[PDB]
Amino acid sequence: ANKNMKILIVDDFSTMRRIVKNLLRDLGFNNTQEADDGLTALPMLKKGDFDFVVTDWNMPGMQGIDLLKNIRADEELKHLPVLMITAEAKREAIIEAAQAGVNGYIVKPFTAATLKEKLDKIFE
Ligand SMILES: [Mg+2]
């Protein structure tokens, strides 16, 4: 796992964006940027050459599931591994996210410990 991989953190609650960001900082990943909704994350991915996406699942403008779909329908972006953040792991929403092509999921609140298992798991 390369620690200079360009990571996009997507979440509508800015405090959550900065917590995810410091957890990634504690793990060797410092190349992080932010977006507050999928509508604002999309143009960032579209032009920014990112390597990894961490997105919230429920956002007001465009949802986590709809950004993953747009990423997956975009020829240029379809190779992007996506980790989803969710308030509780309901079986039904996860299966849906799995079917939509997400790489993994993590339930909040979470720690740097969990985050890394999730990252290792995704990258295999
Ligand atoms: Mg949210």
What letter represents residue 63's amino acid? Answer: Q
Euclidean distance between the first and final Cα of the chain, in Å? 10
Ligand 1 centroid to residue 66 C-alpha, Å: 13
Beta strands in the chain (DSSP E): 7-10, 32-35, 52-56, 82-86, 104-107
Residue-range domains of the chain with CATH: 1-124 (3.40.50.2300)
Q: 11 labelled as ligand-binding?
A: yes
Tell me the longest C-alpha to C-alpha distance in the chain. Answer: 34
Nearest to 70 by CA among 107, 35, 25: 35
Contact 4, 31 (CB under 8 A): yes
Cis, bond preceding 60 (omega within 30 deg of 0)? no
Contact 87, 41 (CB under 8 A): no
| Structure determination technique employed | X-ray
Query: How far is 87 from 108, CA to CA, in rounded Å?
Result: 5
Ligand 1 centroid to residue 56 C-alpha, Å: 5
C-alpha distances out from residue 32 to 63, 103, 109, Å: 20, 19, 20
Quick one: resolution in A? 2.4
What is the chain's length? 124
Nearest to 84 by CA among 55, 47, 118: 55
